[PDB]
């Protein structure tokens, strides 16, 4: 973070995929170097698209998992259901990839057989092996990165089916025990969103979720099948 570009012109972490291309004039790439200069005046409109959890219908019955893959949009909303993580090629990734255990961890670039590689993802065969199963058995709940053209991509889970289907159904990818008493994070968490109003704080949150510069940072406590987790969440309360 000290000097994002080292003395030799290159990005300071060479295990980071750095294939960025700001061809749509969104200025997401300048925000990479000046992230506290983010212009927040569009946030009230972008965040108005997300509905609070109390707007959602009560769930019931036993909980199953999400294999539908419906045309969902807007990963910046907490209720976004993602698809399960797989391997993604470095050619489409711009910046560090963080996965959430719920605690944040970075997945450097590797070759297809998992050996580490160190060329900022310029090889067309470099990948980021993000395949996830939910811990304690697995590794992490979900991941979040930025693609070349500047869109927040995210994966993980799969999310949960809490009962009902249609207009106002909540496919829970976080702790939704408000709507289903078994919809805990460990059962249903699929990434950084710890509650409908908290996401995990990590060094690039403000770049991947810039309309959360707003949020207050709370020390929170997560229990994942025994192993106690003490991590920082950025929550929207006021």
């Amino acid at each position, epitope marked *: 973070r000290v000097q994002l570009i080292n003395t030799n*012109g290159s990005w300071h972490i060479n295990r980071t995929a750095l294939n*960025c*291309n700001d061809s749509l*004039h969104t200025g*997401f790439l300048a925000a990479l*170097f*000046y992230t506290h*200069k983010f212009n927040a005046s569009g946030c009230p409109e972008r965040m108005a698209h997300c509905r609070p959890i109390d707007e959602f219908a009560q769930g019931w019955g036993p909980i199953t998992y999400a294999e539908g893959h419906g045309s969902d949009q807007r990963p910046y909303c907490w209720h976004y259901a993602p698809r399960q993580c797989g391997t993604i090629p470095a050619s489409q990734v711009c910046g560090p990839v963080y996965c959430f255990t719920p605690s944040p961890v970075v997945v450097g670039t590797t070759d297809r057989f998992g050996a580490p590689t160190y060329t900022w993802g310029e090889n067309e065969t470099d990948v980021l092996i993000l395949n996830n199963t939910r811990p304690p058995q697995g590794n992490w709940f979900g991941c979040t990165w930025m693609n070349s053209t500047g869109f927040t991509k995210t994966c993980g889970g799969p999310p949960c089916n809490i009962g009902g289907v249609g207009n106002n159904t909540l496919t829970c990818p976080t702790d939704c025990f408000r709507k289903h008493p078994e919809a805990t994070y460990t059962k249903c968490g699929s990434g950084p969103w710890l509650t409908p109003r908290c996401l995990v704080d990590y060094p690039y949150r403000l770049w991947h979720y810039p309309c959360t510069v707003n949020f207050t940072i709370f020390k929170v406590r997560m229990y994942v099948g025994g192993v106690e987790h003490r991590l920082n969440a950025a929550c929207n309360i006021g």
Partner: antibody
Amino acid sequence: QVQLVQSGAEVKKPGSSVKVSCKASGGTLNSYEITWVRQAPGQGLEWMGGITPIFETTYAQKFQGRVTITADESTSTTYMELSSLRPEDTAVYYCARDGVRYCGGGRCYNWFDPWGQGTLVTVSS
Amino acid sequence: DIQMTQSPSSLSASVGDRVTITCRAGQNINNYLNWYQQKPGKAPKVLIYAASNLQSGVPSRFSGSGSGTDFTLTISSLQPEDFATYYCQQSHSTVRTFGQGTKVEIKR
């Protein structure tokens, strides 16, 4: 989607100074990588200086001490002030955005896009 | 500051011909080099960035190449609407420096 809009044209007597403004709007930063370049009639391009989003200024070799670049984030307006005007500084003064726009091979590159509409400054008696 | 030298200053070429514009940097700038096109009466627009990458919308006839100190711009088959002055500009130092420019004109 960002737009740079420079101030109108200026007529100045030799020896005085001029302050060209460049206001940025409609973008994702509150302050931009603002760079300045001029071009005399029929002449080539001459780079003068720039300012980072956190207001750090760089200047060219032949203009230092004569040019000052300032910012104001409330209006997102960048200012360029050149002093001791001479007849030879008759030029059209451009402001542009020199932000990062491509990273590859572990390196990132900047170039001028978009441009302001220009400001003509004539220096005569 | 890094001195960029362009060659030649003026050039007249028939349509369909091939034109080679050289930019020579004072010191090694690797590939931190852009090419602007300037039609008279208008602001310049970039056409090639990072030595060799074609900006969006630019015809494949234009092409950049070179790394370090010697850079060229090549228009494979000149066209009537390619009349302009072309400038190279290094982006290796924070103090940006331009080339002297190459005005190209349609021979007939």
